[PDB]
């Protein structure tokens, strides 16, 4: 594509520079170019891809929420607020479609190790969840089921192949719990998942080095924060 003439190593180096410069749209474009080289991504490279797109879509989601709130207030008791919310929504859908397209061509198909496969299936669940946040049409239930299916496959692999303190397994559980609460209208499933994940991780902390303990406890605190918000 647009980054087709740049070396893969140069795209990765530029993604790291764009991260330092807080240029997340450029970071995402460099990482999309690196994925399109066709080689599998290392752990560090998967995290650069996810940080780039999370920041891009996070800005879009924050803008969409502001616009949706203004639109809802305008329809209580011109077309511009709806038109601009729709423009932001279409741009957000475009970014989610781009990420889902990279996962389907061909990141997931080539991911055989649990660390890579769980990471990409978590990403697939997350980007379908962002599509679900703005969905209204005939495909809304199918978008929610696509998020659920990706998260469930990731969970099934993570439970068989990773320890309960693995940060990818923990982050998957945190996000799938938020999917249950916010998207699937299943608050009890959300709370049960967050609580079991927290408790199973706590019981495995004794096996960890100081650095791994820090990584796992950081995500466990997010599970506890959600449990405090919900209970």
């Amino acid at each position: 594509g647009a980054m087709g003439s740049m070396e893969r190593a140069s795209l990765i180096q530029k993604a790291k520079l764009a991260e330092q410069a807080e240029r997340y749209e450029d970071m995402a474009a460099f990482m999309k170019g690196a994925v399109e080289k066709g080689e599998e991504l290392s752990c560090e490279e998967r995290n650069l891809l996810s940080v780039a797109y999370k920041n891009v879509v996070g800005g879009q989601r924050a803008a969409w929420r502001v616009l949706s709130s203004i639109e809802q207030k305008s329809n209580e008791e011109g077309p511009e607020v709806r038109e601009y919310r729709e423009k932001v929504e279409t741009e957000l859908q475009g970014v989610c479609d781009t990420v889902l397209g990279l996962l389907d061509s061909h990141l997931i198909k080539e991911a055989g190790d649990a660390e890579s496969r769980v990471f990409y299936l978590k990403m697939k669940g997350d980007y379908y969840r962002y599509l679900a946040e703005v969905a209204t049409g005939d495909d809304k239930k199918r978008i929610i089921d696509s998020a659920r299916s990706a998260y469930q496959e990731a969970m099934d692999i993570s439970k068989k192949e990773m320890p309960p303190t693995n940060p990818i397994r923990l982050g998957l559980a945190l996000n799938f719990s938020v999917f249950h609460y916010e998207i699937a209208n299943s608050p009890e499933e959300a709370i049960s998942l967050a609580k079991t994940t927290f408790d199973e991780a706590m019981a495995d902390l004794h096996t960890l080095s100081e650095d791994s303990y820090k990584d796992s406890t950081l995500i466990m605190q997010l599970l506890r924060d959600n449990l405090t918000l919900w209970t």
């Binding site: 997350d126 982050g171 945190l174 996000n175 938020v178 609460y181 997010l222 924060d225 959600n226 918000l229």
Partner: peptide, 5 residues
Amino acid sequence: FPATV
């Protein structure tokens, strides 16, 4: 909003 990673 709840926390996600």
